Short mmCIF file of C-alpha atoms and ligand atoms in Angstrom, two decimals:
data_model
loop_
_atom_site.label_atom_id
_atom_site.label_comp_id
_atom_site.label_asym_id
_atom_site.label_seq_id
_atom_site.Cartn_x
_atom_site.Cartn_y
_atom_site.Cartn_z
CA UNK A 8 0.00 0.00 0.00
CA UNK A 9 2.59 2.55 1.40
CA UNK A 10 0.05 5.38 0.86
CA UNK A 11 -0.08 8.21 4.15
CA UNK A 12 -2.84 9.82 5.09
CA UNK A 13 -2.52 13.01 6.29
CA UNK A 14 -2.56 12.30 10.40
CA UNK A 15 0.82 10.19 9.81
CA UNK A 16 1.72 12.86 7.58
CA UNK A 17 1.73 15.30 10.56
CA UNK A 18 3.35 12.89 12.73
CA UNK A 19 5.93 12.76 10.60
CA UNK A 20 6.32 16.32 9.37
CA UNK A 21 6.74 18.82 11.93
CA UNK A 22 4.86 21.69 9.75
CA UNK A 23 1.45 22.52 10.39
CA UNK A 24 -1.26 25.60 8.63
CA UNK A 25 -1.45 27.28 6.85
CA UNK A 26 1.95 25.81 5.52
CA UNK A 27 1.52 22.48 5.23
CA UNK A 28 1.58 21.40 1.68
CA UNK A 29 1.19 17.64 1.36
CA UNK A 30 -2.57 16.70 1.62
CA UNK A 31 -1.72 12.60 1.11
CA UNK A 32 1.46 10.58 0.17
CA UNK A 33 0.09 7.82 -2.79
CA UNK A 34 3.43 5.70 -3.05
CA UNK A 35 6.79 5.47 -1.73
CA UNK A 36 10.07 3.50 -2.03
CA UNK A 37 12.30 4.52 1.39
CA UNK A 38 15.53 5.80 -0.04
CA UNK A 39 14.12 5.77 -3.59
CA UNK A 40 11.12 8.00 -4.53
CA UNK A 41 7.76 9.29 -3.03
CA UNK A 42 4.64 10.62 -4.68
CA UNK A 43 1.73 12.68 -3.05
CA UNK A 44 -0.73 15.16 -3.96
CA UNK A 45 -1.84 18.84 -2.73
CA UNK A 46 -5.50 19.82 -3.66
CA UNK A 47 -5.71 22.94 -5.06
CA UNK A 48 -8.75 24.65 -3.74
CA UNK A 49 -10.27 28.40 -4.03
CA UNK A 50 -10.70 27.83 -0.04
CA UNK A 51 -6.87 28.45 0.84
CA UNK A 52 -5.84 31.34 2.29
CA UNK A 53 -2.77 32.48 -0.10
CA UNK A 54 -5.35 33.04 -2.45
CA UNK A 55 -7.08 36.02 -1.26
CA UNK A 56 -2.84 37.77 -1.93
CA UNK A 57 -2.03 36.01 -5.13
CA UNK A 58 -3.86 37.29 -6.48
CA UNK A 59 -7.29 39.06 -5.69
CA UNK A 60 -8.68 39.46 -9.87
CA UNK A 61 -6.69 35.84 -10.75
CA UNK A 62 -6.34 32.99 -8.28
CA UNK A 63 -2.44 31.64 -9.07
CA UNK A 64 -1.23 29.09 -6.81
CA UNK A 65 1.98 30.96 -6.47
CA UNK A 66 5.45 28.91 -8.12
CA UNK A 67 6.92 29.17 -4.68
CA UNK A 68 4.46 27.10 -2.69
CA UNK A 69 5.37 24.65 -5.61
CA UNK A 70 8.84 23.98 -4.60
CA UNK A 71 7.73 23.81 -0.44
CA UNK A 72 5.07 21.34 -1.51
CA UNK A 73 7.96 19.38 -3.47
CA UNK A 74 9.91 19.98 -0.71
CA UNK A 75 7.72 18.92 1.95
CA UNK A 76 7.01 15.38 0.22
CA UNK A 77 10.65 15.30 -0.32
CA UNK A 78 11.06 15.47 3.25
CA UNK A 79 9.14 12.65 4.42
CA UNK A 80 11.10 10.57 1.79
CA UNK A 81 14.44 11.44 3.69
CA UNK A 82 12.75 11.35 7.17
CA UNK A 83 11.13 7.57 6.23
CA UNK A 84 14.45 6.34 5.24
CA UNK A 85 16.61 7.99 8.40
CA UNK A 90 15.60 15.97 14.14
CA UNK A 91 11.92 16.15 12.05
CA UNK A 92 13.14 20.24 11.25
CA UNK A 93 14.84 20.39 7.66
CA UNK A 94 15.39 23.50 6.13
CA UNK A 95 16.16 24.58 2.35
CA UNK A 96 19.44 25.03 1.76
CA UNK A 97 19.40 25.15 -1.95
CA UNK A 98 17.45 24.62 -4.91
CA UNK A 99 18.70 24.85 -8.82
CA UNK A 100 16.85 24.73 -11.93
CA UNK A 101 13.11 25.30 -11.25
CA UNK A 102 10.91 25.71 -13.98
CA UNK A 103 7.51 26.49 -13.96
CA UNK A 104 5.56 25.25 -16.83
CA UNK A 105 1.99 26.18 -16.16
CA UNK A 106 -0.11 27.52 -13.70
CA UNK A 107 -1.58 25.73 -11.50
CA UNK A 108 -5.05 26.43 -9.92
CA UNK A 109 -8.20 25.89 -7.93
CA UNK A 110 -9.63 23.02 -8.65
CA UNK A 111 -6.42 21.14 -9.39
CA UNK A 112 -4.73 18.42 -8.05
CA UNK A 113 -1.10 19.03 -7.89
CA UNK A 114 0.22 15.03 -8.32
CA UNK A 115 4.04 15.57 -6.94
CA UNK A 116 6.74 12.81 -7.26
CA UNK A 117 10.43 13.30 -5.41
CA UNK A 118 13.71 11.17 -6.10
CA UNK A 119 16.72 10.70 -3.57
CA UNK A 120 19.77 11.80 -5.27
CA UNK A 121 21.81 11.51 -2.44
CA UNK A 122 21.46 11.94 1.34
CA UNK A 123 24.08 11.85 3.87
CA UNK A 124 23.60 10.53 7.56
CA UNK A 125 26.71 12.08 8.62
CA UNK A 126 26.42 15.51 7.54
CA UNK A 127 22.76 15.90 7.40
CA UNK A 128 22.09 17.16 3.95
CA UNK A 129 19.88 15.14 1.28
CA UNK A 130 19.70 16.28 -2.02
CA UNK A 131 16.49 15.23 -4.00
CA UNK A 132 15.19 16.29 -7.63
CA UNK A 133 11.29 16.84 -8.03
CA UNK A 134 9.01 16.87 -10.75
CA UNK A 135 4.84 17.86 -10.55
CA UNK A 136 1.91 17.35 -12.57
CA UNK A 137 -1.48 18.63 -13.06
CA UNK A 138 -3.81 16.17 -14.89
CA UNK A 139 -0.65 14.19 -16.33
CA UNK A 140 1.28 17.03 -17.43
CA UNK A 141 4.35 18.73 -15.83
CA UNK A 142 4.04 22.09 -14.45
CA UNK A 143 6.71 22.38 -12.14
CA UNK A 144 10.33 20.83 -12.37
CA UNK A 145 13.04 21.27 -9.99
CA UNK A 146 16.71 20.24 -11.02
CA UNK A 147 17.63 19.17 -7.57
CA UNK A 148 17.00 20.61 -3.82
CA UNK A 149 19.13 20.33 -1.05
CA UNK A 150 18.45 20.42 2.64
CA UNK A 151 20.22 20.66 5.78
CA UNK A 152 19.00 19.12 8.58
CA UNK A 153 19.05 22.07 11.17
CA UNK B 9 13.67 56.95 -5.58
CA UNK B 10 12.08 55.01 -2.27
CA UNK B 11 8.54 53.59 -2.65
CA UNK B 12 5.75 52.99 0.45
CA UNK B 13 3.77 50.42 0.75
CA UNK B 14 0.77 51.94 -1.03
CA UNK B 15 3.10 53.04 -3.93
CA UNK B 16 4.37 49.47 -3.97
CA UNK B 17 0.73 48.25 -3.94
CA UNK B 18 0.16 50.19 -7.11
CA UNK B 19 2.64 48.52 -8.64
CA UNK B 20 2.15 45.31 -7.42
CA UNK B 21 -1.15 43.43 -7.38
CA UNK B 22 0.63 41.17 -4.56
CA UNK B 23 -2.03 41.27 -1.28
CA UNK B 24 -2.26 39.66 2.12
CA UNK B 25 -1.53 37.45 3.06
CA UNK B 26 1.67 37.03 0.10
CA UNK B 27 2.96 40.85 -0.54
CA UNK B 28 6.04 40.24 1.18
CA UNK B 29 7.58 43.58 0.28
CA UNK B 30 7.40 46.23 3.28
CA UNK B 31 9.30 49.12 1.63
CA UNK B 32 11.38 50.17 -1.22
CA UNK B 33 14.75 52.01 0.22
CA UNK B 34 16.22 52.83 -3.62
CA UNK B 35 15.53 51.78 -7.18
CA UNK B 36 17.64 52.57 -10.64
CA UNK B 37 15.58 51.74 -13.16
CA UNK B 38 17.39 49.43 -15.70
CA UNK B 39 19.76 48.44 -13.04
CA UNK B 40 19.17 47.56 -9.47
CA UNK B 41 16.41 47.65 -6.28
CA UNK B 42 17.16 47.84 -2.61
CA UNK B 43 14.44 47.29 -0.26
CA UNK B 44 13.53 45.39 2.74
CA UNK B 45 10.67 42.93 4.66
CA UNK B 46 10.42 43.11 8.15
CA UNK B 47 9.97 39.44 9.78
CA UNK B 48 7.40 39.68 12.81
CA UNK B 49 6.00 36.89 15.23
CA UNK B 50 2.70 38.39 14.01
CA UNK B 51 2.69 36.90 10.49
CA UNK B 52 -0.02 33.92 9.44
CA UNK B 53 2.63 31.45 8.25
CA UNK B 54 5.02 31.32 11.17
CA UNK B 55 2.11 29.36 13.27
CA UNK B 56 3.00 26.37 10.32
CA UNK B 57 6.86 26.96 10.12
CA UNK B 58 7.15 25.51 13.02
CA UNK B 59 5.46 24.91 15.78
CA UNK B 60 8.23 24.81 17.58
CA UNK B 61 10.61 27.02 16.12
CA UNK B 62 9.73 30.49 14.85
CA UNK B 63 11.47 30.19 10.87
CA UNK B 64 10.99 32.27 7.78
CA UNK B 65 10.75 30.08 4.91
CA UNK B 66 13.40 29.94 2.35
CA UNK B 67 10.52 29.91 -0.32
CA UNK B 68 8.94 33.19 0.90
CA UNK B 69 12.52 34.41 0.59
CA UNK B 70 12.57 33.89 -2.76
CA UNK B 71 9.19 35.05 -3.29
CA UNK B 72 10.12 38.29 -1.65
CA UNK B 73 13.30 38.53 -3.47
CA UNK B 74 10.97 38.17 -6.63
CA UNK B 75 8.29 40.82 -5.65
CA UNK B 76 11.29 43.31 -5.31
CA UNK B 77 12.38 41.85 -9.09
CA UNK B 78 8.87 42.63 -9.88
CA UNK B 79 9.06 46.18 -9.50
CA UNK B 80 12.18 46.68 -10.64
CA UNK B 81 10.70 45.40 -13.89
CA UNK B 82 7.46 47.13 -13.99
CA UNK B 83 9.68 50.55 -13.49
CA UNK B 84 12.09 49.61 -16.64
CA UNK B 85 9.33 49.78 -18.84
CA UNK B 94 4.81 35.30 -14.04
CA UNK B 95 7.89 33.58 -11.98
CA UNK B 96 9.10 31.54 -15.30
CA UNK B 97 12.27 30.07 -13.82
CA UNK B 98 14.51 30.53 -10.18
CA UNK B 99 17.97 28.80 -10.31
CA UNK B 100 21.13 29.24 -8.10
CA UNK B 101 18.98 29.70 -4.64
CA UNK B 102 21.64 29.40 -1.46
CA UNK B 103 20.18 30.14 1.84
CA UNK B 104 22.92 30.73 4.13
CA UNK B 105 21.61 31.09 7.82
CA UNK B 106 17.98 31.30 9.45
CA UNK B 107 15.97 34.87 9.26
CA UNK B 108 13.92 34.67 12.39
CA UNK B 109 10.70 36.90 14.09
CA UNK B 110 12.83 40.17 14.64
CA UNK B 111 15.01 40.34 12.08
CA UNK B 112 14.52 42.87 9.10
CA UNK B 113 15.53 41.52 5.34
CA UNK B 114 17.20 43.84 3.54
CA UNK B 115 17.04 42.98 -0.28
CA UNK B 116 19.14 43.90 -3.32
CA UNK B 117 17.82 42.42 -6.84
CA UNK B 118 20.25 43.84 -10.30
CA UNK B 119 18.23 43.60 -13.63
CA UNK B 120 21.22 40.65 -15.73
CA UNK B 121 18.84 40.74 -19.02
CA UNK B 122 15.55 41.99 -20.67
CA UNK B 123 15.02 40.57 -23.80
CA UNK B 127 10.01 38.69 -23.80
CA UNK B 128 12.11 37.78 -21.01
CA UNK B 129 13.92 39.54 -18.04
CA UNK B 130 16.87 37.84 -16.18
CA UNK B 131 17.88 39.27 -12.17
CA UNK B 132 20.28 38.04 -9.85
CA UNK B 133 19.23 38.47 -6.02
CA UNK B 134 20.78 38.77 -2.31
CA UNK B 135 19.18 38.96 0.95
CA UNK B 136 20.73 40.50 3.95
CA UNK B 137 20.29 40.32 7.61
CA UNK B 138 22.50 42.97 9.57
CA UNK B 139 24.75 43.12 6.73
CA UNK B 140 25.17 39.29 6.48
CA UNK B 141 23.96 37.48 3.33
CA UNK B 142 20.93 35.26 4.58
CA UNK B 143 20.09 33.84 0.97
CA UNK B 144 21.66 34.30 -2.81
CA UNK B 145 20.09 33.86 -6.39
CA UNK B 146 22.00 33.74 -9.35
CA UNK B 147 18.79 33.76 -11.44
CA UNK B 148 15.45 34.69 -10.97
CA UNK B 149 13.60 34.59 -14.29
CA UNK B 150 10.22 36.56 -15.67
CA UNK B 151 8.37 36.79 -18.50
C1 LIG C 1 9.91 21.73 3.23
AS1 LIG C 1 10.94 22.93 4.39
C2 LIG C 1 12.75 22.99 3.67
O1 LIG C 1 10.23 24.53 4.38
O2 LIG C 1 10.95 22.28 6.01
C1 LIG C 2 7.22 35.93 -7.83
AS1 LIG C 2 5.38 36.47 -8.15
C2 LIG C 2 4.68 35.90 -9.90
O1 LIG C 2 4.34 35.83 -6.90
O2 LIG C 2 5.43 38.21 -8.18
CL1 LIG C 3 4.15 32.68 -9.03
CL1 LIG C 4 12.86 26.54 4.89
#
């Protein structure tokens, strides 16, 4: 099964509204690859700022969504507080909006027990097709 | 010039709770936009980042970095691309971000490289921030 609902989501991420991002974890592979969701809805409350004549799920909420899922991966395969320490080669493709269903997958690259930094690239979708891709982000465990 | 924060909502059609600009200090239009975001205990998303421990989010960094890109852009006349991010140390409630964005290339498509400061101490880098 390996899916998480969002209870042991929370138990295992220590962020909490309005900036948690990962509404359900659908697969994962410890030390591999994860994919989750975030549904998009009209009834969040960035959208009243971004903006008020065009609802926009703004590109950076993208990345911490990608981020967030990326950070149960490393948490379910090895301190719950990881912080961005980098990020290279985002592209947004698309907007994404209410109503949507952002599908989000994250791969390990590399992450390193000793030093506490994981590096993982991240890729997500919006019925099938890529709207965000991120070349690789890096985190330090704090 | 300097810009207020009801100049820099006429510019900007950024509102709560995501305008993360609080003032402009100087802008060369063309070249290069100083401004800053002060970081209070009173903001909605520090409740969710953490708990526990009071952070500013690298992404809203970015974000902010990119509003002040924004207007730098509007005065030289979405977020396509970010690449080169490097947060160096934590901004925390109490702090104020200082923020320098230079204009690299406008060509449809503008290009700006960005630094964040707290105290005089680079908090985050990007080499490029990309619009169109
Ligand atoms: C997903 As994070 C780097 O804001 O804890
Ligand atoms: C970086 As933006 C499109 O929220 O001004
Ligand atoms: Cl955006
Ligand atoms: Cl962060």
């Amino acid at each position: 099964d390996t899916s998480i609902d969002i209870e042991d989501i929370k138990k295992i991420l220590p962020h909490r509204y309005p900036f948690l991002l990962v509404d359900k974890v659908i697969y994962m592979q410890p030390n591999k690859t994860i994919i989750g969701l975030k549904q998009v809805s009209t009834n969040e409350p960035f959208f009243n700022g971004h903006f008020p004549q065009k609802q926009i799920m703004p590109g950076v909420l993208q990345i911490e969504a990608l981020a967030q899922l990326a950070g149960i991966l490393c948490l379910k395969s090895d301190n719950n507080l990881f912080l961005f320490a980098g990020v290279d080669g985002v592209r947004w493709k698309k907007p994404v909006l209410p109503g949507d269903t952002l599908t989000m997958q994250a791969n390990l690259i590399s992450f390193k027990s000793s030093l506490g930094i994981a590096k993982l690239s991240g890729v997500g979708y919006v019925n099938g097709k890529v709207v965000i891709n991120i070349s690789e982000m890096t985190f330090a465990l704090s």
